[PDB]
């Protein structure tokens, strides 16, 4: 059975980047979608597009630079068997900051550095690099 | 608590001139500075990684005349302090009263300086300081007291110093026989041959 779709999304992205697929697609969700927002906002993806009424289908379009993939690495941090909450002062850096770490906060989803600026911690969803 | 033996032997062992003798007479004339001490001097096989580090450590220790526990303590202090660990250590070493005196030129050798310090010749801010390990601070004037000012050795030392170029981080007066420790020295001011990093590594085993 499916226990974590955020995980499934990250894996699918990983494999599409691995396989030189232009895009990748999967069932759509709100959190999934705000994550896609984020990633675009940080320019690891070219664009996402959700489609469907009933069981809508999210479609990420992947990004390749000088051939190689652009999401060097992507790895979940919290998870249903083990969640990972942090205080603002406790926010990690991804790749010494050359990367990002997606985080949910009470003010929606967003990367680590935006969170720092805002001044509030939350749930570290995943590192991207 | 002090090394009382042959000084040039140590130098020989190290490889370099450690400045353990005044410098009236050149070190090559006094001893086989290239050849290592003992029966098996001429033989010189390449040392190990540990060994080189150890040697380096010894050199520095030898130069200043600091035994091992004290050295370790100094290292620890340096580590604790903010900034480049090795350079901090170096600074600390410099800061020693005897070393400062030597730099100024009131002692021919560091040993001489140390002796002077011991024998209540030197004052730091007009107060007789007897400890060779006393860490002299910025803007701390350090002078020969009026009793020890008549000594022929002191003037000789001064003369010797003069032949040698002066350190930028001090300011000394030959007539007044009082020098001001203006600031703690920068790494650039000290000798380049000392690999502080090796020393640091040795203690970071």
């Amino acid at each position: 059975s499916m226990q974590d779709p955020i995980a499934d999304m990250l894996t699918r992205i990983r494999n599409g980047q691995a396989a030189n697929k232009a895009a990748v697609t999967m069932p759509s969700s709100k959190l999934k979608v705000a994550i896609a927002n984020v990633l675009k906002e940080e320019g690891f993806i070219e664009d996402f597009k959700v489609e469907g009424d009933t069981k809508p289908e999210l479609e990420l379009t992947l990004k390749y630079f000088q051939g190689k993939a652009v999401v060097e690495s992507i790895q979940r941090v919290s998870r249903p068997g083990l969640r990972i909450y942090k205080r603002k002062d406790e926010l990690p850096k991804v790749m010494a900051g050359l990367g990002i770490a997606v985080v949910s906060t009470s003010k929606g989803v967003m990367t680590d550095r935006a969170a720092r600026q805002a001044g509030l911690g939350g749930e570290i969803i995943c590192y991207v690099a | 608590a002090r090394y009382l033996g042959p000084k040039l032997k140590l130098s020989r062992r190290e490889g370099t001139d450690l400045f353990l003798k005044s410098g009236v007479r050149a070190i090559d004339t006094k001893c086989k500075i290239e050849q290592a001490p003992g029966q098996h001097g001429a033989r010189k096989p390449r040392l190990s990684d540990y060994g080189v580090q150890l040697r380096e450590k010894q050199k520095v220790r030898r130069i200043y005349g600091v035994l091992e526990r004290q050295f370790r303590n100094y290292y620890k202090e340096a580590a604790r302090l903010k900034g480049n660990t090795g350079e901090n250590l170096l600074a600390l070493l410099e800061g020693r009263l005897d070393n400062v005196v030597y730099r100024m030129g009131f002692g021919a050798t560091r040993a001489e300086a140390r002796q002077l310090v011991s024998h209540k010749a030197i004052m730091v801010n007009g107060r007789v300081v007897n400890i060779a390990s006393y860490q002299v601070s910025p803007n701390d004037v350090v002078s020969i007291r009026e009793k020890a000012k008549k000594q022929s050795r002191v003037k000789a030392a001064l003369e010797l110093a003069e032949q040698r170029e002066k350190p930028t981080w001090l300011e000394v007066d030959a007539g007044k026989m009082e020098g001001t420790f203006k600031r703690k020295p920068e790494r650039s001011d000290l000798s380049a041959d000392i690999n502080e990093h090796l020393i640091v590594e040795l203690y970071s085993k």
Binding site: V70, M95, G97, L98 | G83, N84, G86, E196, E201
Partner: protein
């Protein structure tokens, strides 16, 4: 200009009809005190020739690196077959912290101020290979700015 460090030598043997025929292996490495680095692993009946062979091999098949002023550009891992490696850029003055062959590779690489430990096997050869790997994988902030279509300030 280029300096060079013979890290390790080891005697090795071939069993034959007659007996044990010994040769020797030489693991050297070189760097120009800048990003470039390269290692040579030569073999010969006699040591001098083996090391000369490794010096040849290292001189070529070098590899460039992005080195922040005297140190790395970020914490990295790098692995070869039993020697996994974690290095972390370290403050000026700290010196090169590392055990052995790794110390040498860094030393020739020109880096000065690091924190480096080695997980797993310490076989000189594999671990130096892991070092060169973790140094090659490493990217500089400008280079991320490039990959991602951005200004460096955008990344800070």
């Amino acid at each position: 200009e280029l300096q060079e460090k013979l890290i390790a030598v080891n005697r090795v043997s071939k069993t034959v009809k007659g007996g044990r025929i010994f040769s020797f292996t030489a693991l050297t490495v070189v760097g120009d005190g800048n990003g470039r680095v390269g290692f040579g692993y030569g073999k010969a009946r006699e040591v001098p020739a083996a090391i000369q062979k490794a010096m040849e091999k290292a001189r070529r098949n070098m590899i460039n690196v992005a080195l922040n002023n005297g140190t790395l550009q970020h914490p990295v891992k790098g692995v070869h077959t039993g020697s996994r490696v974690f290095m972390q850029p370290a403050s000026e003055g700290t010196g090169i912290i590392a055990g052995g062959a790794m110390r040498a590779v860094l030393e020739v690489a020109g880096v000065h101020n690091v924190l480096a430990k080695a997980y797993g096997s310490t076989n000189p050869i594999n671990v130096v290979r892991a070092t060169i790997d973790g140094l090659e994988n490493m990217n500089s902030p400008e280079m991320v700015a490039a990959k991602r279509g951005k200004s460096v300030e955008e990344i800070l």
